[PDB]
Amino acid sequence: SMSVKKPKRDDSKDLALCSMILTEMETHEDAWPFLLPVNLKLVPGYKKVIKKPMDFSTIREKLSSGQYPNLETFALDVRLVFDNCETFNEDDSDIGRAGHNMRKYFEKKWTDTFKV
Numbered sequence: 001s002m003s004v005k006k007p008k009r010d011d012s013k014d015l016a017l018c019s020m021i022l023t024e025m026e027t028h029e030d031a032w033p034f035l036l037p038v039n040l041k042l043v044p045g046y047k048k049v050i051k052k053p054m055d056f057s058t059i060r061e062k063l064s065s066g067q068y069p070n071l072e073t074f075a076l077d078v079r080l081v082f083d084n085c086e087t088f089n090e091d092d093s094d095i096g097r098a099g100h101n102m103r104k105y106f107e108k109k110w111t112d113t114f115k116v
Ligand SMILES: Cn1cc(C(=O)NCCCNC(=O)c2ccc(F)cc2)ccc1=O
Pocket: 032, 033, 034, 035, 036, 038, 039, 043, 084, 085, 088, 089, 095
């Protein structure tokens, strides 16, 4: 509270670490459904069903222009990608399984990097 400050993390490396984690996502072989925005003029239903579309290139753009205030909001956008994926696709479809794979890949790197 006012004039009662907490021991805080050292966040000076966060931007560089989030960029490295996103680079590993972008280069994973199962990243192909997520590299670019879902083509709303070519995918029937997506616009109406998915309230907040999100993809790796939009996340990369936001990270390179200072639009994430903290690493918590960055993880929100990453998880948003895979939440959208689960909502719209079958778990055992190709896109659906890629999303499960990529989510597990992300959460391991998140813990390995920031829960040390
Ligand atoms: C997450 N999600 C993705 C799609 C979807 O149709 N995505 C198109 C991928 C095109 N296929 C590629 O291989 C590719 C894409 C970009 C790139 F830079 C290189 C290759 C549909 C429903 C859904 O829920």
